[PDB]
Amino acid sequence: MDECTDEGGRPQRCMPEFVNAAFNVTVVATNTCGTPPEEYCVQTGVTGVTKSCHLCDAGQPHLQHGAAFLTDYNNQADTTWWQSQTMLAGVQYPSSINLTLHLGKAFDITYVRLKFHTSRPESFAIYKRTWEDGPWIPYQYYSGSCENTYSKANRGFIRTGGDEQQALCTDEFSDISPLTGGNVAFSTLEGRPSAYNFDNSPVLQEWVTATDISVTLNRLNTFGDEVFNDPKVLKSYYYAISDFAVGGRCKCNGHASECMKNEFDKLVCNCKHNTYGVDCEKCLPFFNDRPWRRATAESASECLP
Amino acid sequence: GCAEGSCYPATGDLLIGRAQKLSVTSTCGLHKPEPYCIVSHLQEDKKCFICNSQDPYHETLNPDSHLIENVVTTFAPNRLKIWWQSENGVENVTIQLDLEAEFHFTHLIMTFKTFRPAAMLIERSSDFGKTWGVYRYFAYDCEASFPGISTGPMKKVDDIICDSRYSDIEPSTEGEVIFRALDPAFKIEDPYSPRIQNLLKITNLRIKFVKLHTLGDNLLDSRMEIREKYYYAVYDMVVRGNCFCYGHASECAPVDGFNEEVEGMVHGHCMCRHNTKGLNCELCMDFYHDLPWRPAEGRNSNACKKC
Amino acid sequence: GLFPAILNLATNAHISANATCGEKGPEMFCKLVEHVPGRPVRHAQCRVCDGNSTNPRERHPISHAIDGTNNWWQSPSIQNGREYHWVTVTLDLRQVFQVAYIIIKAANAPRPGNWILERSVDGVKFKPWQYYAVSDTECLTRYKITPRRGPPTYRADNEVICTSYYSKLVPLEHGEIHTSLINGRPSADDPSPQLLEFTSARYIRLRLQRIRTLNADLMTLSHRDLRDLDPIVTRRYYYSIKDISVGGMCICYGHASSCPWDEEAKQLQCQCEHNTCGESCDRCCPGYHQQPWRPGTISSGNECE
Ligand SMILES: *[C@@H]1O[C@H](CO)[C@@H](O)[C@H](O)[C@H]1NC(C)=O
Ligand SMILES: *[C@@H]1O[C@H](CO)[C@@H](O)[C@H](O)[C@H]1NC(C)=O
Ligand SMILES: *[C@@H]1O[C@H](CO)[C@@H](O)[C@H](O)[C@H]1NC(C)=O
Ligand SMILES: *[C@@H]1O[C@H](CO)[C@@H](O)[C@H](O)[C@H]1NC(C)=O
Ligand SMILES: [Ca+2]
């Protein structure tokens, strides 16, 4: 749907391509090993190394574990994984180790996925950014201590007619079952009562919009050896995610085909239907015949002169 | 600051150096080898082969060995092709760990081959088999396998319960069973008391099999010609623990009389510091009997005072 | 008495496909949330499906489903049409067996959400065995069947249940489905006579009607224009099956030892041993009018005296 009008005089709704929202973009992470010479190793079943007690080095690309390896082609021949600092830094806070993706425009994010290289964190969550420099709201809460960590009901659900914007807490990924390449995925329209009629739901349309996405790794799942505080035990727990998968489209509210990076070094929607703006939110001043509306499937949502 | 404060011994794998100390009443490849395979084999062009466990495993000469004493952790990239294979139609299978002295056990991970066993339980022995405790119960159906055992969330740190979180029906891709003696979050604090110490120190760990998953095809017959579809098999089991020293030294020297010039084993003899004596440093040494023995916690050395 | 040896019924049987990609020229399929493996340099993350090409990996027909050692066929990408949600797979065993279990595992797609397991004896009438849905709620709304609670158990020998535990999206890659028909039944040890025909069929139909979705299609849908959909957002949705292995016993009441292939009739039939009679070991020879013919049991062969 990269066209405005095919054969008729009136145009139709035009949607952008479903390109990945994390490809070839640098993600900012609070922590990153490599400048400190630090060794670590756990049960080596993840890869097959005899000990895997090597070091994180920033100067060695073949040994670095920074945020660059997080987003990439995700080739199955040689996966690239970002690794945080181990428990030597003591990763258990009221705060957390947070990594945030910057996009520069509102994107129609549909799903979020992660590929845990080493283990699923016991308690972690992923956050939103409705508008630039705006407040954060969460997608979903994965924790085995829903009532203790976030004080929320485990395996929560939203009934019909309720506030579907509010997130939930569930223990779907709490036990470290895969221990290698753990797949966790969340979709924006999962469990929403108004999902079927989402095209006529203003609340979902605004809520699904996102500019930046961050993950709050609250608690790191541990075997239970933290009591001894052994140095080998201390370095045997860490965070490692190999793929940061998030899907979305350049949200111009269905009034543009493609978004092109102009000389301002910022993305702008090539708005059609006599509109201009970051998301085609306003029609041209000469074309204020009718109020602006979302590009519904049935209608075209154009601005007459 | 081991001398000024307290340093705890490093925790490592137990199987390294203890591979020969494995026992089980279920091993294929006996004096009469027999075929053993399961439905839905994908990566192998041939359906299955013959178990031959009369020789220790070799990369090329003996690639079909399935002894319990040859299975190790992922030491080599050939981890995918080393494991032990049980017999046909076995319901009471048991494996155990043999320890020279009392060790500390906290958790074990076993990567199964075909199916997580229907019934799984751990048997505890803190006095070299004189008593027989239990850790936890795993069952596909708790009441069917272990009736009278509570099922659900955590109740107590040291309470035996039955959980189905590790007895699923889709373990083919090297599925493993997670067990933790001490909960990551349900532990209020570290008493370091005999109540928790006697419930954590282990002389001979015991793993028992009570049931095996059935796909329904073998429930209509009692013939030996079809029992080979169902069997237990573990890619690798790893047990992490440390030499018990009451928090005096951060390491244990190799056991005397052992000539293993390898890096990785975990011993059970602690050198004595802060004026103490004994195999595990359980008593103050000479001229320092003035104060009673006390454990070392945090930065408190709690060294025995001179008489 | 003595059932014949186990044989994989799916290996030597014919399989029919309702629709597979590649038969309509080239076809472009993008993995749901992830990129293509890096063998072809490919920013547009679709491997080219094909049906008539020189590269074996390009072609993905159903002739690689069971007979292939490790391969798969994928349903055509919905960009061709929305009607491709309903795809049926037929298992042509050519003879009536005693099916005990079925194994289905995907290759590069989530396990199908809504799909039925229909049996057949006469080749015309089809009776389903188990019902599958994306959620336990969908079982009551769509199939009007109460889903089972906790572990999948049978309250009756001939009961039919709707199980959603095998439709979870968590096993995104190589998701597995293990269906049992005897375990958990009240007459589990002794196969009840009514359970015999319930577990006996000649054709097993793997009717797939709905694909498991991450709400990608629901984000962009056009009810008014059903023939105009965004190719990119729908190319990520398709079925994929890589193994339909099935096992069972020959239906001759366990009065044989094996079921070797017969060159005379091109059919697989057990031998009529243990003093049995008839072409299919389903009768007793003349001279035993005192004892009417009846099938044997597990405990004894029940000779025709
Ligand atoms: C990412 O974008 C930059 C900007 O042009 C380009 O130079 C680089 O090659 C791109 N890398 C990938 C992997 O697409
Ligand atoms: C297992 O059980 C069978 C019969 O129930 C018995 O003959 C056999 O000795 C048992 N073996 C073990 C190791 O318990
Ligand atoms: C396409 O496939 C058909 C069979 O499905 C074949 O007859 C035809 O030659 C093929 N077209 C080619 C190879 O160009
Ligand atoms: C076979 O597929 C077509 C679409 O290609 C669909 O309309 C039809 O319903 C399917 N067959 C059955 C029996 O559902
Ligand atoms: Ca990567």
Author numbering:
A (entry chain G): 37 to 341
B (entry chain B): 29 to 335
C (entry chain A): 28 to 332
Source paper text:
Laminin polymerization is the major step in basement membranes assembly.
We employed cryo-EM to determine a 3.7 Å structure of Lm complex consisting of 56 kDa α1, 64 kDa β1, and 52 kDa γ1, assembled into a functional trimer. The asymmetric cryo-EM structure of the Lm polymer node resembles a triskelion with centrally located LN domains and three rod-like structures projecting outwards, each containing one or two LE domains. The interface involving α1 and γ1 differs from other inter-subunit interfaces, as it is mainly electrostatic in nature and it involves a calcium-binding site from γ16, the latter fact with implications for the mechanism of sequential assembly of LM trimer. The cryo-EM structure reveals that the α1-γ1 interface involves a loop spanning residues K58-Q72 in α1, and another loop from γ1 containing residues L106-T116. The loop from γ1 consists of amino acids critical for coordination of a calcium ion, including D108 and T1166.
